[PDB]
Enzyme design. Structure first.
Site, PDB file in Angstrom:
ATOM      1  N   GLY C  67     -22.492 -28.881   2.792  1.00  0.00           N
ATOM      2  CA  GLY C  67     -21.405 -29.847   2.765  1.00  0.00           C
ATOM      3  C   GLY C  67     -20.303 -29.459   1.805  1.00  0.00           C
ATOM      4  CB  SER C  96     -23.743 -22.815   0.985  1.00  0.00           C
ATOM      5  OG  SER C  96     -23.158 -24.012   1.457  1.00  0.00           O
ATOM      6  CG  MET C  97     -22.772 -27.316  -0.550  1.00  0.00           C
ATOM      7  SD  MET C  97     -21.917 -26.259  -1.740  1.00  0.00           S
ATOM      8  CE  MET C  97     -22.319 -27.049  -3.297  1.00  0.00           C
ATOM      9  CG  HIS C 121     -22.157 -19.838   3.717  1.00  0.00           C
ATOM     10  ND1 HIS C 121     -20.868 -20.195   3.387  1.00  0.00           N
ATOM     11  CD2 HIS C 121     -22.786 -20.985   4.066  1.00  0.00           C
ATOM     12  CE1 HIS C 121     -20.730 -21.503   3.512  1.00  0.00           C
ATOM     13  NE2 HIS C 121     -21.879 -22.005   3.922  1.00  0.00           N
ATOM     14  CG  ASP C 170     -23.542 -17.218   7.443  1.00  0.00           C
ATOM     15  OD1 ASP C 170     -22.717 -17.274   6.508  1.00  0.00           O
ATOM     16  OD2 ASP C 170     -23.462 -17.929   8.466  1.00  0.00           O
TER      17      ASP C 170
END
Ligand SMILES: CN(Cc1cnc2nc(N)nc(N)c2n1)c1ccc(C(=O)N[C@@H](CCC(=O)O)C(=O)O)cc1
Ligand SMILES: Nc1ncnc2c1ncn2[C@@H]1O[C@H](COP(=O)(O)OP(=O)(O)OP(=O)(O)O)[C@@H](O)[C@H]1O
Ligand SMILES: Nc1ncnc2c1ncn2[C@@H]1O[C@H](COP(=O)(O)OP(=O)(O)OP(=O)(O)O)[C@@H](O)[C@H]1O
Ligand SMILES: [Mg+2]
Ligand SMILES: [Mg+2]
EC number: 3.4.21.92
Lengths: 353, 178, 192, 352, 111, 111, 100, 46
Positions: C67, C96-97, C121, C170
């Protein structure tokens, strides 16, 4: 008269009590100050000086009762110890505060002079705190009922002297030696007062990023809180405001530390180590306590939260097995206690002889 | 440790000043048995009914006037009288109405002897309700040749009784976003 | 519909929702896209638990696909600020987050289920406007990449150069592979 | 000469079965007390103190049995008490000073003998306050009794009422020092195991990192009770001052099936022997098969009442027999088998 | 019956009644039988937390533990003729058969 | 009326009032009629689970189970010319009629 | 005032105060005028306190604790019939105006 | 202070404390004053 100074008596109290420096000073200054008025009575002084009734507030096993007992030994005035848990209101079947003065006369040898110069140590003053919230049917025959009676004695009343010793004859030798000239020292542990004091001094905590969140270890101990006690706190505990006012000086003891506990094991005249060594020698075996073990014992006792009394538990346990088989086995000369034994991973080595 | 041994009659008519209207020997035996080898505080009026000093007991007459005899201890105040007994384990108050009324507030036990005979006595024992006096010993006798009427004995000890509490609960109230 | 459960206590029985019941046990759920609204909700829960017991660890489940970065930097700063250790358990997916918030947990208290997937990523963005503004926005997103790359290297133990070469595109990592990089410590397969 | 702890333990093994720690603690305590009396001249500057025991064990373990067994062999005056009757001073309930009175009666008024005695305050767990929290009302039977005993355990001069003990013609307060009287308390402390579990076991919650045991691997009452510390007793409702006067804390262990089997025949007054006496005084023999004893033990354990459960199981198995046998004639012996304990069969009476 | 130290009755009066029937013959009273009716009303309200002393419930159970098993009760010396002035009669309850009784309404559901 | 050991009243007062009207003659008091008004206020407020102790409700019902049927009650010491206190007058309530009146507001719905 | 069984002062207490003002006499007390006040605020959602008073106002004999003048010599707790005492029960019913 | 001639302190003691101060002279006794304090504490919110 007044040959010993506060410093002198403090050096005498340190032989039996290890620590409690502030308490010793307060007890010394007050005893000396009260004694000076006693030397000359009114001292031909117009102004009326206030009394120095002491209120000993300390944790369990801190030395409250010990101080009173050792102080009595070096004193010459009559000293009588009274327990507040056996005193009941007047008329009931329990003891009455009036007999406290009678006991004092026995110790005083019926000497009116000595009688009005005595010291009365009232232990367990924290067990009479009125707690019942408006009962309205029963009587506090062991709480407030006794607090009011004590006020009269510390604030003045007649103490008519009967000729207890001299064969009772039809003669009235009662001169009514007022009790106001008696130093009343009230002891007690006040279990729970720390919580009361905490709320008054509670900084207050929140939930955000600017709040004051503190861990349990980062908090303050009862010793620190007790030192900051005030009269308002004693009232919440269940003590009459007038009663605490009669006792202006409050001496707050401090929870014994590892160092103090280590000293109590060997320094005192009748320390635990010497006590166990005595019985071990009574059987014909020498007892040796390594210095390493002493610190270990103190660490465990500090967690029991029973003060100096914890030491007896740790020691008795460690020697339980030994004391069970030692009186039966022969060819034994000495026993050595090491740190490993206290932890429980080793068995005390025996010097067979 | 004060006591107020008496011979209370119907409607608590002690009749101490006036000669005992019953003269029950047994009532005197109870008195003697429970008052021997201990001091016996009394009154000058009561001391004029017996006359001779009671043997074996430290007679302490509480008379405002000076002492008239030298075979019994003489006191002139209530506070000194209790002290004058010493450190004995139990004190017995046998004086009349005035004495009883003065020592009862500081009395722990009551060696009462309830006589059934009805007399129009002028002096009376103080009033004592029964909720606070917890009886310990009781004996019931019957009238005989020497004892004109029946006589009952009793002993009591002032002891308090506690009472339970309301036992209230703490209800909870829930709040929702709307 | 969220089921309602009952909890037996000395005072009596109380009915709470399943999520609220788990909150009492210091369990926070991180599900769905990360945004400001849900981020503040998690921040509030962390702060509330800290006051109740600042010495008991906190468990944070992560079943999110990623997000907003800013929403995820508040949670990260809140976890590093509070005294109690915040344990992180990957449940299914961690982007990622989610992965940045999975490796930020207390060292030794990071977990990843056997069949969980972790993806890392580089930050995504974009701006439409004048060239002068594009440069300002371009420099800022490049600082966030370097800043996030440095934080991951600190929590994983890998060199900054490796993180730059592994996050460019990625990178999907399974639970056993995450243990070798440092995103997690152990894998939970059974109770004992 | 004085008896050794080993000797004392032997006398305590004739009646008790399976409590080794409690037997050692009590043996050394009595041994120490005996030498603390013999060595009355105090040939050392030190003033030898005393350690008070606190028996903490589950129901039907031998708490009261040990106390009774001790009184049989020891010579110094011994007394038993009940904390449920004691109340604070000034109330209708009994007074703590009465304990000394009962000790004086068994000492023959010899204060010296009474001044060195052993007391056994039973049911000490019933006077425990609800919790460490302050009491809104005067706990006459709770805290009150605790605060009243504080001085008695450490030592004080108690004014026992006159004309007590053996001496009838006395009108003067007798004095007895309570500084050399070994007070052995004892209680069941039902519910303490939970308090201990909250401390020794933490982390129990909902989650992947929490802990779950299923009650199969969870520690038992005995195991938990063996880790008791003063902090736990305080939560249970024992004021810290009272715990301090009770340094020694001996914990009994929940009897096991093996131990229960031995208790049925080995003890001096074993349960089996009691019943045999009944059947024998009337004129009939009674015997129990080894398999039967094992069956009984399993059933008793389920009752969760300790050794007491045995008496219930035995009474039921022989209920019908004890109802019809008194009238039966020409019967000399009865035999209890495993089948009888489960009800599938009935005791086989040997006619003769 | 109520716990000791409260306005209610006590568990020692039961011996007084047994004594009266036995004609104050301690030996006879020591080998007597007792029937405590309504033994289901002194039950502990287990659902409530231990925050107050059940002087009527659990309080009475804790007092009979030693009576039903054996102790030395102290009864007041009351009766027609009582030789001990204040020497409370000692009665051993180790040979007195107790027969409790109650209705236990609700136990069926528990089972 | 409340359970024993509490601040309220006890069920034995009912028998004391009957003696005041019987010139403290136990014999006559043992052949009297009683009327307990407001018997609907000592009824459990639909508290079948028995969460707490209803000293004013169920507790009073549990104390009358033997008074209404018959028992040797311990009447308070005295409220008249009786001199002793420990007397604790013993009256048999097995021949004492007991009327009980109430309003039972709500019973109409139950029926 | 409060119901029975609770710490709150019992309704019978009012009878005590009445007799005290009567100077230990029945005739006077029988011809007395008690004045209850603040009757409002003890209403529904209270009911229990209103149930006890409901009887005293319409006649009830009550045991008067024997304490006062010579500790009230009468050994029958000086009973008094409460069916001749004018009970002037007042109160400021705040809100009744709206109801009406 | 508590209920007059009942459980607790006796209020009658106060009128007696000043009796001796008035040399047992009803006249002077009536002219006396009784300074009660801390009355805000016993005030209800029993
Ligand atoms: C007038 N009178 C007062 C008296 C009488 N009976 C009482 N009875 C009781 N229970 N209590 C008293 N206070 C009491 N007092 C008397 C009368 C005689 C003796 C008397 O002669 N007593 C003998 C005992 C009787 C005897 O053997 O002569 C003694 O030795 O004390 C004492 C008090
Ligand atoms: N400062 C000290 N120095 C030496 N011994 C100590 C000290 N404090 C405690 N003790 C030991 O503790 C015992 C006495 O404890 P004490 O009676 O002083 O505790 P207390 O504060 O009175 O407890 P409570 O508050 O329960 O009355 C003695 O055996 C003594 O050896
Ligand atoms: N280890 C044992 N050996 C022999 N008999 C035992 C043992 N344990 C229990 N008993 C039996 O239990 C009875 C003694 O009960 P115990 O002394 O355990 O009281 P308790 O149940 O511990 O006390 P409380 O009821 O207060 O918990 C005796 O009748 C005895 O036969
Ligand atoms: Mg002390
Ligand atoms: Mg037992």
């Amino acid at each position: 008269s007044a040959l010993p100074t506060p410093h002198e008596i403090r050096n005498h109290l340190d032989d039996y009590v290890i620590g409690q420096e502030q308490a010793k000073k307060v007890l010394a200054v007050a005893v000396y100050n009260h004694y000076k008025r006693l030397r000359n009575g009114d001292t031909s002084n117009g102004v009326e000086l206030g009394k120095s009734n002491i209120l000993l507030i300390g944790p369990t096993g801190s030395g409250k009762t010990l101080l009173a007992e050792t102080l009595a030994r070096l004193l010459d005035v009559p000293f009588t110890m009274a327990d507040a848990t056996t005193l009941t209101e007047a008329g009931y079947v329990g003891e009455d505060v009036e007999n406290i003065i009678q006991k004092l006369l026995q110790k005083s040898d019926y000497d009116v002079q000595k009688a009005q110069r005595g010291i009365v140590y009232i232990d367990e003053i924290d067990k009479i705190s009125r707690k019942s919230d408006n009962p309205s049917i029963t009587r506090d025959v062991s709480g407030e009922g006794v607090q009011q009676a004590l006020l009269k004695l510390i604030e003045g009343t007649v103490a008519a002297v009967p000729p207890q010793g001299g064969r009772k004859h039809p003669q009235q030798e009662f001169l009514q030696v007022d009790t106001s000239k008696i130093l009343f020292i009230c002891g007690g542990a006040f279990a729970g007062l720390d919580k009361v004091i905490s709320h008054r001094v509670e900084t207050g905590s929140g939930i955000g990023f600017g709040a004051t969140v503190k861990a349990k270890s980062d908090k303050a101990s009862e010793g620190e809180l007790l030192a900051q006690v005030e009269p308002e706190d004693l009232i919440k505990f269940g003590l009459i405001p007038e009663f605490i006012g009669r006792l202006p000086v409050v001496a707050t003891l401090n929870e014994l530390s590892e160092e103090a506990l280590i000293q109590i094991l060997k320094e005192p005249k009748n320390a635990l180590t010497k006590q166990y060594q005595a019985l071990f020698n009574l059987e014909g075996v020498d007892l040796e306590f390594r210095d390493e073990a002493l610190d270990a014992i103190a660490k465990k006792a500090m967690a029991r939260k029973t003060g100096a009394r914890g030491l007896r538990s740790i020691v008795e346990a460690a020697l339980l097995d030994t004391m069970y088989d030692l009186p039966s086995m022969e060819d034994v000369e000495k026993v050595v206690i090491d740190e490993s034994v206290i932890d429980g991973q080793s068995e005390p080595l025996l010097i067979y002889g | 440790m004060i006591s107020l041994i008496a011979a209370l009659a119907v409607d608590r008519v002690i009749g101490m000043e006036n000669a005992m209207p019953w003269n029950l020997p047994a009532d005197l035996a109870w008195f003697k048995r429970n008052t021997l080898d201990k001091p016996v505080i009394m009154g000058r009026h009561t001391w004029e009914s017996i006359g001779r000093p009671l043997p074996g007991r430290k007679n302490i007459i509480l008379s405002s006037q000076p002492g008239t005899d030298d075979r019994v201890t003489w006191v002139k105040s209530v506070d000194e009288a209790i002290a004058a007994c010493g450190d004995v384990p139990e004190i017995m108050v046998i004086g009349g109405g005035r004495v009883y009324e003065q020592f009862l507030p500081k009395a722990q036990k009551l060696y009462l002897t309830h006589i059934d005979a009805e007399v129009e006595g002028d002096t009376h024992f103080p009033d004592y309700e029964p909720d606070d006096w917890e009886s310990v010993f009781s004996e019931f006798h019957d009238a005989d040749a020497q004892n004109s009427h029946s006589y009952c004995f009793e002993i009591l000890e002032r002891r308090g009784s506690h009472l339970g509490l309301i036992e209230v609960e703490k209800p909870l109230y829930c709040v929702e976003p709307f | 519909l969220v089921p309602m459960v009952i909890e037996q206590t000395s005072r009596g029985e109380r009915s709470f929702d399943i999520y609220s019941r788990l909150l009492k046990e210091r369990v926070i759920f991180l599900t769905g896209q990360v945004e400001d609204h849900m981020a503040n909700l998690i921040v509030a829960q962390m702060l509330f638990l800290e006051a109740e017991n600042p010495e008991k660890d906190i468990y944070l489940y992560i079943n999110s696909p990623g997000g907003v970065i800013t929403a995820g930097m508040s949670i990260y700063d809140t976890m590093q600020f509070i005294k109690p250790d915040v344990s992180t358990i990957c449940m299914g997916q961690a982007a990622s987050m989610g992965a940045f918030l999975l490796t930020a947990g207390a060292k030794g208290k990071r977990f990843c289920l056997p069949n969980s997937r972790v993806m890392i990523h580089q930050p995504l963005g974009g701006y439409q406007g004048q060239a002068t503004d594009i440069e300002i926005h371009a420099r800022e997103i490049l600082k966030v990449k370097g800043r996030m790359n440095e934080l991951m290297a600190l929590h994983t133990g890998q060199s900054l150069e490796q993180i730059e070469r592994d996050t460019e595109r990625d990178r999907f990592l399974s639970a056993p592979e995450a243990v070798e990089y440092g995103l997690v410590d152990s894998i939970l397969t059974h109770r004992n």
